[PDB]
Enzyme design. Structure first.
Site, PDB file in Angstrom:
ATOM      1  N   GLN A   1       0.922  -1.234  -0.063  1.00 27.71           N
ATOM      2  CA  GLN A   1      -0.098   0.017  -0.117  1.00 27.71           C
ATOM      3  C   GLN A   1       0.935   1.398   0.001  1.00 27.71           C
ATOM      4  OE1 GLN A   1      -2.651   0.303   3.255  1.00 27.71           O
ATOM      5  NE2 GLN A   1      -3.830   1.971   2.628  1.00 27.71           N
TER       6      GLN A   1
ATOM      7  N   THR B   1       3.119   2.548  14.041  1.00 31.98           N
ATOM      8  CA  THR B   1       1.340   2.014  13.718  1.00 31.98           C
ATOM      9  C   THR B   1       1.285   0.594  13.319  1.00 31.98           C
ATOM     10  OG1 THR B   1       1.472   2.768  11.347  1.00 31.98           O
ATOM     11  CG2 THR B   1       1.041   4.509  12.917  1.00 31.98           C
TER      12      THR B   1
ATOM     13  N   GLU C   1      26.811   3.497 -12.358  1.00 31.58           N
ATOM     14  CA  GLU C   1      27.720   4.654 -11.446  1.00 31.58           C
ATOM     15  C   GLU C   1      27.376   4.615 -10.137  1.00 31.58           C
ATOM     16  OE1 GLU C   1      30.635   6.096 -14.292  1.00 31.58           O
ATOM     17  OE2 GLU C   1      30.358   6.470 -12.076  1.00 31.58           O
TER      18      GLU C   1
HETATM   19  N1  LIG Z   1       5.577   6.498   2.703  1.00 36.48           N
HETATM   20  C1  LIG Z   1       4.563   6.039   3.259  1.00 36.48           C
HETATM   21  N2  LIG Z   1       4.518   5.185   4.155  1.00 36.48           N
HETATM   22  C2  LIG Z   1       3.570   4.613   4.676  1.00 36.48           C
HETATM   23  C3  LIG Z   1       2.070   4.945   3.941  1.00 36.48           C
HETATM   24  N3  LIG Z   1       1.376   4.118   4.293  1.00 36.48           N
HETATM   25  C4  LIG Z   1       1.623   3.294   5.307  1.00 36.48           C
HETATM   26  N4  LIG Z   1       2.876   3.429   5.592  1.00 36.48           N
HETATM   27  C5  LIG Z   1       4.002   2.923   6.316  1.00 36.48           C
HETATM   28  O1  LIG Z   1       3.722   1.289   6.159  1.00 36.48           O
HETATM   29  C6  LIG Z   1       3.908   0.747   7.415  1.00 36.48           C
HETATM   30  C7  LIG Z   1       2.944  -0.329   7.573  1.00 36.48           C
HETATM   31  O2  LIG Z   1       3.194  -1.095   6.426  1.00 36.48           O
HETATM   32  P1  LIG Z   1       2.194  -1.167   5.043  1.00 36.48           P
HETATM   33  O3  LIG Z   1       2.782  -0.514   3.943  1.00 36.48           O
HETATM   34  O4  LIG Z   1       1.034  -0.643   5.475  1.00 36.48           O
HETATM   35  O5  LIG Z   1       1.953  -2.778   4.759  1.00 36.48           O
HETATM   36  P2  LIG Z   1       1.524  -3.127   3.174  1.00 36.48           P
HETATM   37  O6  LIG Z   1       2.954  -2.908   2.601  1.00 36.48           O
HETATM   38  O7  LIG Z   1       0.367  -2.268   2.858  1.00 36.48           O
HETATM   39  O8  LIG Z   1       1.220  -4.757   3.403  1.00 36.48           O
HETATM   40  P3  LIG Z   1       0.046  -5.214   4.138  1.00 36.48           P
HETATM   41  O9  LIG Z   1       0.330  -4.898   5.689  1.00 36.48           O
HETATM   42  O10 LIG Z   1      -0.457  -6.628   3.895  1.00 36.48           O
HETATM   43  O11 LIG Z   1      -1.213  -4.517   3.894  1.00 36.48           O
HETATM   44  C8  LIG Z   1       3.680   1.971   8.469  1.00 36.48           C
HETATM   45  O12 LIG Z   1       4.669   1.768   9.443  1.00 36.48           O
HETATM   46  C9  LIG Z   1       3.659   3.123   7.755  1.00 36.48           C
HETATM   47  O13 LIG Z   1       4.858   4.002   8.466  1.00 36.48           O
HETATM   48  C10 LIG Z   1       2.097   5.911   2.787  1.00 36.48           C
HETATM   49  O14 LIG Z   1       1.135   6.182   2.420  1.00 36.48           O
HETATM   50  N5  LIG Z   1       3.541   6.470   2.655  1.00 36.48           N
HETATM   51 MG   LIG Z   2      -0.445  -4.475   1.891  1.00 42.22          MG
END
Ligand SMILES: Nc1nc2c(ncn2[C@@H]2O[C@H](COP(=O)(O)OP(=O)(O)OP(=O)(O)O)[C@@H](O)[C@H]2O)c(=O)[nH]1
Ligand SMILES: [Mg+2]
Lengths: 48, 428
Positions: free
Chosen positions: B11, B170, B245
């Site tokens: 996500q 979180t 590079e």
């Molecule tokens: N840079 C950025 N980080 C995010 C965002 N949304 C969530 N995160 C980070 O992602 C972490 C949680 O992991 P997720 O990316 O939600 O997990 P996932 O890749 O979606 O995989 P699933 O848990 O199975 O849904 C949190 O600690 C956030 O710091 C975003 O929109 N932008």
């Molecule tokens: Mg995910």
């Protein structure tokens, strides 16, 4: 009850618009120095 | 011919990939429908009547944030097979994403990466963006790198992670997702860059003055790192730094490939036209030990190599003075087997203003990606959390149910433990 209508526009939808292209038209116009005209005026005609 | 394939899994990878693909698309000038009203070849194909299509592969197991891509303004720019989704998510569970629900979407991802790589006259690298700390970013993403390394070898796999931040996370079960995803990030990754979220919060709250930043504003500054890193791929400059590079000047030994980011002409309106932003000013703020994008303060670390990528109207002699004044500063220390520890690149294309965004017009920028022994603390911080949770086997019944034994936990803590050990032996 009304529906709070979705206002929202992502990063990818907001924060860039197509910029004007940069105005570039400038070569390196070099005035040539004219070839300095040559009299290392030679030997035969020089002294005799 | 220069061509980088972006693979955004998770996500967070979709959302940071959103803000990235507009410094790629309409910075090259292409409209939302996909028409310019060949620099685009770094990120785009071309299909006839001026249709350039992004060279991206969007992966997620929950069909709700990629469905926002299918329904947003930019639905007719992406091809409707480049936004691969699933039926059910991974739920911060590394074993679900890697062993159970990963092996039905990975066969579609490798098809789309195949069709997007045989449309390549020389592939520079796979710029895969993920979020370590989740289920499909740590799971499916780990399996994707293992499959990509076996088939698509000898060409780079630059990975920008979203490694779990120290306090703010979180989640509760993220140490299991981080430590057991270390194996892919240590062997099946050519360049890894630690990029958490607290440091982006701190940059936004100190330089950019947005005291209430959202994830959308975090995706901003991540995207500006990416565009400056591939700036010399597409635009001319005095010195060019392509992805070959990049890895050859920043990776001393093959196992050590972890780096830090900083893109610090971070200015916004009232703090923009008042400050004279010269080459010396932006370089000092890039090396400043609070604009590091990992909460990874290098004042207690040893610098190894730096990759200052000046971008804009930067004069090469001003680069020379800026490098010199960093070297003479004592708290910026370098390891002794490296007298020359900078790879200066210069782009000519200036950074881009944001309408409705957070930054402004700036004529020059720096994006330095640096390897240091200071990065050994982002893994030792999470060593404490994994050791506490695995003491009485909390959350283990989840991870063992769908197909991994409990010995995966111990070998991944062993892979982490052999990891920090290699940093202090290099530094000393
Ligand atoms: N840079 C950025 N980080 C995010 C965002 N949304 C969530 N995160 C980070 O992602 C972490 C949680 O992991 P997720 O990316 O939600 O997990 P996932 O890749 O979606 O995989 P699933 O848990 O199975 O849904 C949190 O600690 C956030 O710091 C975003 O929109 N932008
Ligand atoms: Mg995910």
């Amino acid at each position: 009850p009304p529906t709070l209508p979705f206002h929202g526009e992502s990063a990818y939808r907001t924060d860039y618009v197509p910029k004007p292209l940069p105005e570039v038209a400038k070569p390196v116009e070099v005035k040539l120095p004219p070839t300095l005209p040559f009299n290392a005026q030679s030997c035969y005609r020089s002294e005799y | 011919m220069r061509e980088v394939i972006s693979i955004h899994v998770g996500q967070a990878g979709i959302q940071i990939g959103n803000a990235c693909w507009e410094l790629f698309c309409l910075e090259h000038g292409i409209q939302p429908d996909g028409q310019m009203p060949d620099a685009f070849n770094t990120f785009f194909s071309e299909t006839g009547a001026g249709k350039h299509v992004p060279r991206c592969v969007f992966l997620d197991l929950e069909p709700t944030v990629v469905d926002e891509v299918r329904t947003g303004t930019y639905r007719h720019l992406f091809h409707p097979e480049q936004l691969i989704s699933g039926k059910e998510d991974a739920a911060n569970n590394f074993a679900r994403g890697h062993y159970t629900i990963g092996k039905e979407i990975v066969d579609l991802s490798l098809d789309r990466i195949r069709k997007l790589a045989d449309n390549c006259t020389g592939l520079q690298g796979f710029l895969m963006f993920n979020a370590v700390g989740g289920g499909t970013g740590s799971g499916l993403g780990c399996l994707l790198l293992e499959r990509l390394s076996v088939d698509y070898g000898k060409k780079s796999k630059l990975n920008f992670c979203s490694w779990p931040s120290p306090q703010v996370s979180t989640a509760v079960v993220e140490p299991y997702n981080s430590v057991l995803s270390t194996h892919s990030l240590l062997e099946h990754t050519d360049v890894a860059v630690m990029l958490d979220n607290e440091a982006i919060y701190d940059i936004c709250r100190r330089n950019l003055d947005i005291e209430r930043p959202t994830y959308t504003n975090l995706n901003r500054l991540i995207a500006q790192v990416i565009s400056s890193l591939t700036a010399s791929l597409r635009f001319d400059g005095a010195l060019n730094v392509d992805v070959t590079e990049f890895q050859t000047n920043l990776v001393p030994y093959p196992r050590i490939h972890f780096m830090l980011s900083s893109y610090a002409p971070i200015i916004s309106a009232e703090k923009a036209y008042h400050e004279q932003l010269s080459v010396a000013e932006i370089t000092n703020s890039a090396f400043e030990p609070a604009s590091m994008m990992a909460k990874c303060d290098p004042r207690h670390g040893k610098y190894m190599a730096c990759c200052l990528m000046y971008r804009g109207d930067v004069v090469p002699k001003d680069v020379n003075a800026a490098v010199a004044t960093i070297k003479t500063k004592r708290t910026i220390q370098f390891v002794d087997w490296c007298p020359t520890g900078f790879k200066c690149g210069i782009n000519y294309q200036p950074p881009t203003v944001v309408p409705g965004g957070d930054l402004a017009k700036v004529m020059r920028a720096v994006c330095m990606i640096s390897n240091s022994t200071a990065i050994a603390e982002v893994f030792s911080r999470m060593d404490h959390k994994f050791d506490l949770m695995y003491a009485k086997r909390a959350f283990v019944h989840w991870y063992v149910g769908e197909g991994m034994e409990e010995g995966e936990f111990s070998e991944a803590r062993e892979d982490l433990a052999a990891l920090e050990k290699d940093y202090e032996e290099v530094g000393i």
